[PDB]
Amino acid sequence: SLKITEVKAHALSTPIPERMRVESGAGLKLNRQMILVEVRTDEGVTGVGSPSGPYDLAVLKRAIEDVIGPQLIGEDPANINYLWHKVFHGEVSRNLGHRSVGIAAMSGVDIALWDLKGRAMNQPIYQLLGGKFHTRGVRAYASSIYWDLTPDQAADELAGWVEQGFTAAKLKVGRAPRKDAANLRAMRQRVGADVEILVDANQSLGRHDALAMLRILDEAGCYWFEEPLSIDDIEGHRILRAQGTPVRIATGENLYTRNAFNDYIRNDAIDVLQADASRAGGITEALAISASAASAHLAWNPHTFNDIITVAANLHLVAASPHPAMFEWDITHNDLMTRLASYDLKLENGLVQPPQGPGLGFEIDWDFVAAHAWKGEPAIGAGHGM
Amino acid sequence: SLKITEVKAHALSTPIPERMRVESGAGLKLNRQMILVEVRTDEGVTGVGSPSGPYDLAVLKRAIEDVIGPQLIGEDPANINYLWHKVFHGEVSRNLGHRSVGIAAMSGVDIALWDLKGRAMNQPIYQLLGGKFHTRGVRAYASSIYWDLTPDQAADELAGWVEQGFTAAKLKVGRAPRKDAANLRAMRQRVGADVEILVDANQSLGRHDALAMLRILDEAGCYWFEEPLSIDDIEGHRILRAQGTPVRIATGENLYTRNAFNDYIRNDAIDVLQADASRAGGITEALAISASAASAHLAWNPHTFNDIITVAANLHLVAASPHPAMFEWDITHNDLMTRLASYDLKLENGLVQPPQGPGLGFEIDWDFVAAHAWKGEPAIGAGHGM
Numbered sequence: 015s016l017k018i019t020e021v022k023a024h025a026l027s028t029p030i031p032e033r034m035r036v037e038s039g040a041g042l043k044l045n046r047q048m049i050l051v052e053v054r055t056d057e058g059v060t061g062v063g064s065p066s067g068p069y070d071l072a073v074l075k076r077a078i079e080d081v082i083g084p085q086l087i088g089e090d091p092a093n094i095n096y097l098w099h100k101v102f103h104g105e106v107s108r109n110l111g112h113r114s115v116g117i118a119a120m121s122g123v124d125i126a127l128w129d130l131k132g133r134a135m136n137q138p139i140y141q142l143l144g145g146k147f148h149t150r151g152v153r154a155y156a157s158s159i160y161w162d163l164t165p166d167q168a169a170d171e172l173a174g175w176v177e178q179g180f181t182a183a184k185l186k187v188g189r190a191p192r193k194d195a196a197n198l199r200a201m202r203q204r205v206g207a208d209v210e211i212l213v214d215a216n217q218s219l220g221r222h223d224a225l226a227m228l229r230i231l232d233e234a235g236c237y238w239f240e241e242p243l244s245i246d247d248i249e250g251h252r253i254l255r256a257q258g259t260p261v262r263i264a265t266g267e268n269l270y271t272r273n274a275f276n277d278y279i280r281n282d283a284i285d286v287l288q289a290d291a292s293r294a295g296g297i298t299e300a301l302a303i304s305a306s307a308a309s310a311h312l313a314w315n316p317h318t319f320n321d322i323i324t325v326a327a328n329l330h331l332v333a334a335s336p337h338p339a340m341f342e343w344d345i346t347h348n349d350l351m352t353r354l355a356s357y358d359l360k361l362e363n364g365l366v367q368p369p370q371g372p373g374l375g376f377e378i379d380w381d382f383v384a385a386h387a388w389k390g391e392p393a394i395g396a397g398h399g400m
Numbered sequence: 401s402l403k404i405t406e407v408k409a410h411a412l413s414t415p416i417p418e419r420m421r422v423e424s425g426a427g428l429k430l431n432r433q434m435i436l437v438e439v440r441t442d443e444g445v446t447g448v449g450s451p452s453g454p455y456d457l458a459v460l461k462r463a464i465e466d467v468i469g470p471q472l473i474g475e476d477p478a479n480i481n482y483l484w485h486k487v488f489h490g491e492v493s494r495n496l497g498h499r500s501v502g503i504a505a506m507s508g509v510d511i512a513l514w515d516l517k518g519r520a521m522n523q524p525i526y527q528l529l530g531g532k533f534h535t536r537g538v539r540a541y542a543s544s545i546y547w548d549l550t551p552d553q554a555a556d557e558l559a560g561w562v563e564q565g566f567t568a569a570k571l572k573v574g575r576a577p578r579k580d581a582a583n584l585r586a587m588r589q590r591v592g593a594d595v596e597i598l599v600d601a602n603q604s605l606g607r608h609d610a611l612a613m614l615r616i617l618d619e620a621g622c623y624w625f626e627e628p629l630s631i632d633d634i635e636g637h638r639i640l641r642a643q644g645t646p647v648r649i650a651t652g653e654n655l656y657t658r659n660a661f662n663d664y665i666r667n668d669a670i671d672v673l674q675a676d677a678s679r680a681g682g683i684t685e686a687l688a689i690s691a692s693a694a695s696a697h698l699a700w701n702p703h704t705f706n707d708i709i710t711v712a713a714n715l716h717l718v719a720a721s722p723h724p725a726m727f728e729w730d731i732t733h734n735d736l737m738t739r740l741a742s743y744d745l746k747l748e749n750g751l752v753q754p755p756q757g758p759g760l761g762f763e764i765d766w767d768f769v770a771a772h773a774w775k776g777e778p779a780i781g782a783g784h785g786m
């Protein structure tokens with residue numbers, strides 16, 4: 015057997031050229047940052063992970079190394095299930111909060127344990143999970159077309175991603191619903207019916223404005239309506255879904271553990287569960303959520319947006335899952351997507367394939383890591399919702 | 401990458417001395433039988449499985465070899481998720497029925513694919529599933545004390561199993577409710593409060609008789625009431641569960657796929673889901689049911705009763721699952737529990753451990769297999785419920 019010797023959190027920051035900084039309800043992007051989790055063992059098998067973002071890097075590092083870490087030192091890393099519960103019940107739930115940055119921290123560590131397990135077995139994670147369902151590849155969408163655009167500019171950006179091979183893309187909405195509607199109508203007109211258009215309000219609307227927007231989305235044949243309302247307003251999501259349109263009500267990037275999603279399902283409030291393996295509790299928890307969605311005849315299509323590790327962790331799960339694919343691919347300026355590891359975006363007929371090596375299935379460029387240590391830069395401006 | 405070259409179903413029968421034949425609502429046992437599934441590949445990596453029983457062996461063999469098999473020949477066995485859906489949607493659901501012996505047949509093949517995957521990776525299945533949760537072992541129960549006994553005899557048999565190390569055991573009921581009650585009362589007095597007593601009616605009661613019995617079970621502090629009613633009467637189960645007693649309402653050995661269990665959960669009709677990996681759709685399907693149970697704050701404790709393969713397949717999953725264990729262990733006369741493979745019952749403080757070899761984790765005695773080919777013997781007498 016192996017024993018865990020260290021749990022490390024490397025805080026990393028990468029710059030965004032001013033002209034490339036985008037804003038949504040979540041805030042204006044400043045720097046693309048991450049924690050790279052490293053779980054090390056006595057025999058030298060190592061796994062890495064990421065607890066996503068934006069979350070404060072010092073908070074994440076402290077939680078990972080000094081709250082979670084001590085629960086892992088000396089333990090056999092093979093018992094991922096045991097360790098998830100030891101950590102959640104022993105420290106994280108009460109001492110960081112049950113729906114919290116602590117759960118994202120746990121997620122990064124869980125992903126590292128799965129990477130470690132795959133590497134120890136010399137197998138890609140998706141093979142551990144019963145192999146592929148999506149044998150030909152996984153349909154991706156370009157994320158996203160952000161705020162501050164004219165209708166023709168928005169349509170131009172969409173045409174651009176479609177040219178690159180994408181069969182679907184997502185539009186940010188919320189700040190100015192009349193502009194959102196104009197943008198959406200121009201975009202649909204430009205690409206026709208063969209391209210799926212997703213919309214994401216980042217919790218920015220109230221119920222009545224969301225009902226008004228849903229009518230537009232329905233007219234435009236939008237695939238889903240993501241975070242239409244505060245995640246705290248479950249009944250509001252039920253009301254939207256009860257309209258019975260072909261537009262899916264989607265949420266989950268800010269909901270944590272299977273428990274949050276159970277509450278939405280129980281209240282008939284959700285069509286697409288978006289639990290991110292790197293946020294909602296780990297690969298371990300995302301697996302459970304995906305299964306629970308299928309039991310209820312609903313879909314699981316994760317949020318994946320932060321770095322190439324959060325993308326890869328989710329992609330292994332998605333490739334293995336029978337849910338129809340609508341896989342989020344961050345197309346914004348992001349060095350953490352392109353330079354962190356040996357794995358890049360390759361679309362074939364609009365599909366991506368998970369990395370094929372052991373564990374997460376690629377190698378970290380530790381030179382890049384050594385060159386991008388965080389020195390206190392902020393990741394994102396203040397969010398909206400006030 | 402491997403390719404599947406054959407899917408074989410070995411029909412086996414083993415006798416039961418008349419003195420050891422037991423009866424429940426399911427019928428009088430005559431012979432302990434099974435299909436040993438064998439999936440072979442071009443490179444010679446082989447997996448085995450079992451679709452449980454009692455199901456007619458010819459129906460099983462035909463389904464496995466000639467309905468399911470043709471969907472598998474030539475395919476990569478690593479893609480278990482893909483193959484499950486290829487088989488279900490392509491053939492089994494419509495052409496064998498959605499809640500059928502066809503699903504059990506699929507389950508035997510799915511287990512064989514998981515055994516194959518584990519053997520190919522040189523890992524026990526529980527390691528693939530995220531490793532152990534129950535690191536110290538899995539709490540087992542002695543299954544079961546059957547019909548036809550006096551209270552004196554029932555109490556004595558229970559004391560015998562407790563002496564062997566069991567901390568829990570199950571009693572068959574349903575033919576004579578007043579005698580059942582007397583047996584239970586004698587059993588509880590005999591062993592005290594520290595031993596869990598489960599009850600199993602094998603669908604043999606009507607609603608009002610089950611309500612009356614539940615009062616008894618509550619009095620005796622029983623752990624669960626298994627198949628109290630027809631599996632077809634979901635509302636009846638809701639009514640029992642709505643009494644709010646500490647007695648769990650349990651069912652699932654005769655329910656198939658996650659869909660059956662979702663219907664029970666949606667109707668507030670179940671405390672313990674008993675989906676058997678070898679009946680309800682495979683390891684693949686049981687994993688999903690276990691997760692769905694947890695999401696709903698309910699328990700998954702599988703039915704495991706037929707042979708050492710059905711026991712082992714479930715035990716890998718149970719060991720890896722955070723559900724409190726109440727693991728079924730057939731203590732009746734059954735050569736398929738003792739002579740088929742090199743994995744015996746070993747209790748330590750009432751706990752069992754999964755096999756530790758690759759795949760299911762033990763080797764088949766192929767000489768025993770060869771010497772016990774089915775010759776048309778029946779497995780079980782007519783069941784009850786009419």
Ligand SMILES: O=C(O)[C@@H](O)[C@H](O)[C@@H](O)C(=O)O
Pocket residue numbers: 038039040041068157214216267317318319342
């Ligand atoms: O840019 C943003 O709005 C957020 O950081 C993302 O998480 C976004 O909600 C998404 O769905 O990827």
Ligand SMILES: O=C(O)[C@@H](O)[C@H](O)[C@@H](O)C(=O)O
Pocket residue numbers: 424425426454543600602653703704705728
């Ligand atoms: O012996 C019997 O009653 C059945 O064959 C079993 O399946 C039983 O219901 C059990 O829970 O193991």
Ligand SMILES: [Mg+2]
Pocket residue numbers: 214216240241267317
């Ligand atoms: Mg979003």
Ligand SMILES: [Mg+2]
Pocket residue numbers: 600602626627653703
């Ligand atoms: Mg039973």
